[PDB]
């Protein structure tokens, strides 16, 4: 049981884009499946669901129909085929299974347990641009302490999003990595620092943006 | 459907109470098919209750459902600090165009007990300047309640430049983190000296600076 979500380099306004929907141990034709999405900062939009078997049913949301389409590829697989994408477009595109059980009974409205993790899709004139990436440590007239924070600043990147991790996902606790914040240009900065004893040896922040294939590795000194 | 979620965002104490309110524009399948879900941020919603009140699977009994046909409830009770996060209705009426709706959304805040936030000043790493851009990156860690920032360059006050950023509550102490950043031209920075930071909760503040190249 997963559901993974495919699809959405960064688009330009004006252009089209398909989604696809992976399911491992559950075959999808049965249930109902639906898409949903998620735009930076705001609440939960519903979009369509589709069940494939018996008598195919479909059904969109008022503002999706006639420019976004569900449907099934395989037994394993449901698309959502997007038109004429805006900038408001942009969010993270979920896929669930409508389904709940009742004893030897099986219904559904609205109950989504099932989810993948989601792909995000990013509508924008803008041209995609990888991270600089710089070293977060305190100020060298400072007097060493018996801990110490240390950090990595990813400043300047698009698409959304990047993932940090820190000593390739070992070092876990004392970790926190911020939010990201949109500048007034369009690029996103994020910061993540991490809390540490001195006498252990060196902290590597791990910067992954996977828009442009760029994966930075940044190992820093107090 | 239109679903109608009030209130907006609620504060609650520890061990405390919070409830939620859906109300549908129409009546809902077997006046029975609404859903709770709990979100935190990075991660796609929890299923909480459904059929109006069907806890899933592992759900604790502090979360209620209640209500029938328009009208719809969800009660926390013993409210702990994991509980913190944003929670949704979804409501469904027939295999039909927007069928299936999602609440607006309600932002639980747990008020947990408070702390004073430690304040931590990084230089511009030396990279910085030769791109032309530098900033100045500032950050406060375990706090609450919330906290306002002020930024100084040579004692006057900073009004453009600035972008903050706060971490989700903590899920074991209902804490914050922030931080804030200060963007400049390499001639404002390599022209200024004195580079401060002001973080502030209500009465109490907690300076930090430094003066460009004590290095
Ligand atoms: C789940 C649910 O919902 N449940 C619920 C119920 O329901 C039910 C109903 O609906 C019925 C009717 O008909 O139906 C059913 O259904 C079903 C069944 O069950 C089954 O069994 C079947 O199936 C199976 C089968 O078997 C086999 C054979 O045999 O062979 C086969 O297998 C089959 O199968 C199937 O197949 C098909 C093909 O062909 C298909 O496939 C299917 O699938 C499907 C499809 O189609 O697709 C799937 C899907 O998913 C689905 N969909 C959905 C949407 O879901 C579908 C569907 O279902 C179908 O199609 C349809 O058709 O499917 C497969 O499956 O099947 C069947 C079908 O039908 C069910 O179960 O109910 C109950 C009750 O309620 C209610 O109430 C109301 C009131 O409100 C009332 O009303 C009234 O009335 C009166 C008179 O009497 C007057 O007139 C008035 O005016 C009105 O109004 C009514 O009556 C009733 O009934 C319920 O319970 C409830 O619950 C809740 C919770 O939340 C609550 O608790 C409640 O309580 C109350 C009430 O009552 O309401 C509340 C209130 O408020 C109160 N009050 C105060 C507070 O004040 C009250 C009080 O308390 C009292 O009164 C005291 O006394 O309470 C309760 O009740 C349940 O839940």
């Known amino acids: 049981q997963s559901l993974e979500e495919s699809g959405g380099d960064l688009v330009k306004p004006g252009a089209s884009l398909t989604l696809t929907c992976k399911a491992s141990?559950?075959?999808?034709?049965?249930?109902?499946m639906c898409w949903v999405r998620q735009a930076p900062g705001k609440g939960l939009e519903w979009i369509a669901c589709?069940?494939?078997?018996?008598?195919?049913?479909?059904?969109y949301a008022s503002w999706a129909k006639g420019r976004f389409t569900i449907s099934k590829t395989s037994s394993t697989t449901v698309t959502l085929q997007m038109t004429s994408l805006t900038a408001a477009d942009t969010a993270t595109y979920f896929c669930?299974?409508?389904?709940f059980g009742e004893g030897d009974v099986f219904y559904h409205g609205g109950v989504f347990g099932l989810w993948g993790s989601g792909t995000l899709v990013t509508v924008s004139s803008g041209q995609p641009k990888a991270p600089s990436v710089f070293p977060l440590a305190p100020c060298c007239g400072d007097t060493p302490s018996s801990t110490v924070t240390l950090g990595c600043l990813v400043k300047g990147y698009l698409p959304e999003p990047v993932t940090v991790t820190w000593n390739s996902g070992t070092l876990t606790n004392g970790v926190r990595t911020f939010p990201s914040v949109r500048q007034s240009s369009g690029l996103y900065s994020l910061s993540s620092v991490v809390s540490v004893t001195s006498s252990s040896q060196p902290v590597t922040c791990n910067v992954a943006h996977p828009a442009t294939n760029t994966k930075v590795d940044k190992t820093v000194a107090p | 459907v239109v679903l109608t979620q009030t209130p907006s965002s609620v504060s609650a104490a520890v061990g405390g109470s919070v409830t939620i309110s859906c109300q549908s524009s129409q009546s809902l399948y077997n006046n029975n098919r609404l859903a709770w879900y709990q979100q935190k941020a990075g991660q796609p919603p929890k299923l909480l209750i459904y059929?109006?009140?069907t806890l899933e699977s592992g759900v604790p009994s502090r979360f209620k459902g209640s209500g029938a046909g328009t009208q719809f409830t969800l009660t926390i009770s013993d409210v702990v600090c994991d509980d913190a996060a944003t929670y949704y209705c979804?409501?469904?009426?027939?295999?039909?165009?927007?069928?299936?709706?999602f609440g607006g959304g309600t932002e639980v805040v747990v008020k947990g007990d408070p702390v004073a936030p430690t304040v931590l000043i990084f230089p511009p790493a030396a990279d910085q300047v030769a791109t032309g851009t530098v900033t100045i990156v500032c950050v406060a860690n375990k706090y609450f309640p919330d906290v306002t920032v002020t930024w100084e360059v040579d004692g006057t006050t900073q009004t453009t430049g600035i972008e903050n950023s706060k971490t989700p509550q903590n899920s074991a102490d209902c804490t914050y983190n922030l931080s804030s950043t200060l963007t400049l031209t390499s001639t404002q920075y390599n022209s200024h000296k004195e580079y401060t930071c002001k973080v502030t909760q209500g009465t109490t503040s907690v300076v930090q600076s430094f003066n460009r190249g004590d290095c």
């Open positions: 141990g559950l075959d999808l034709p049965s249930y109902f």
């Open positions: 979804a409501g469904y009426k027939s295999n039909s165009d927007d069928g299936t709706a």
């Open positions: 669930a299974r409508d389904y």
């Open positions: 059929k109006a009140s």
């Open positions: 589709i069940r494939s078997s018996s008598n195919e049913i479909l059904y």
